[PDB]
Design a protein around this ligand. Structure first.
Ligand SMILES: [Ho]
Ligand SMILES: [Ho]
Ligand SMILES: [Ho]
Ligand SMILES: [Ho]
Lengths: 115, 115
């Protein structure tokens, strides 16, 4: 029982493209539902990566791209800050903490699949 | 690389499981058809990984899991040697060189898809 996260040899790409890559491969953008999965994404991704969590529909209210309010979060201190024009996507960054960033920035594609 | 992208979760498992996992993703076990793809598999795997080539049917004559005789080859010096009771699977080892090994050994799973 578990979910494996897969990484590809592609270059970093914006969230729209990560979303398309993972659905093409019949999966979802990676979602950590606990500290163990958070560290697993951190291990396979190695550089900052997008998570399948956004506050696109309602600002301040992060939701999983597959639906649902968060049960686990690991926000860096003072995140989510929605800096400047607005940050609506999430990256797992330094020491596995989360930062909301622009969905237009390029980051690593991690997809998840069941097990 | 070039016309293919590679997918891994860095999990090490025997060849039957690698093949099963890549079929679950609707892909194929990574096959290098030229030097550029061989470097690409090495880069994404980072450690030793199985290639989709075996000589299970005709001992000493390696073939693609998708069918057909090899067109590219990067054997290490004195390989393939069918050591011990037999070695019928292939892994990419240091410098992207190839070694035939036991299909029961555990190595990194890498699957390929057309780009
Ligand atoms: Ho946001
Ligand atoms: Ho942020
Ligand atoms: Ho063999
Ligand atoms: Ho070998």
């Amino acid at each position: 029982s578990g979910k494996k996260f897969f990484v590809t040899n592609h270059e970093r790409m914006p969230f729209s493209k990560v979303k398309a890559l993972c659905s093409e491969l019949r999966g979802t953008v990676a979602i950590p539902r606990n500290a163990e999965e958070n560290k697993a994404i951190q291990e396979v991704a190695k550089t900052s990566a997008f998570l399948g969590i956004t506050d696109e529909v309602t600002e301040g209210q992060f939701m999983y791209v597959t639906g649902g309010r968060l049960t686990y979060s690991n926000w860096k201190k003072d995140e989510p800050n929605d800096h400047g024009s607005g940050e609506d996507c999430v990256t797992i960054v330094d020491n596995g903490l989360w930062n909301d960033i622009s969905c237009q920035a390029s980051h690593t594609a991690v997809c998840e699949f069941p097990a």
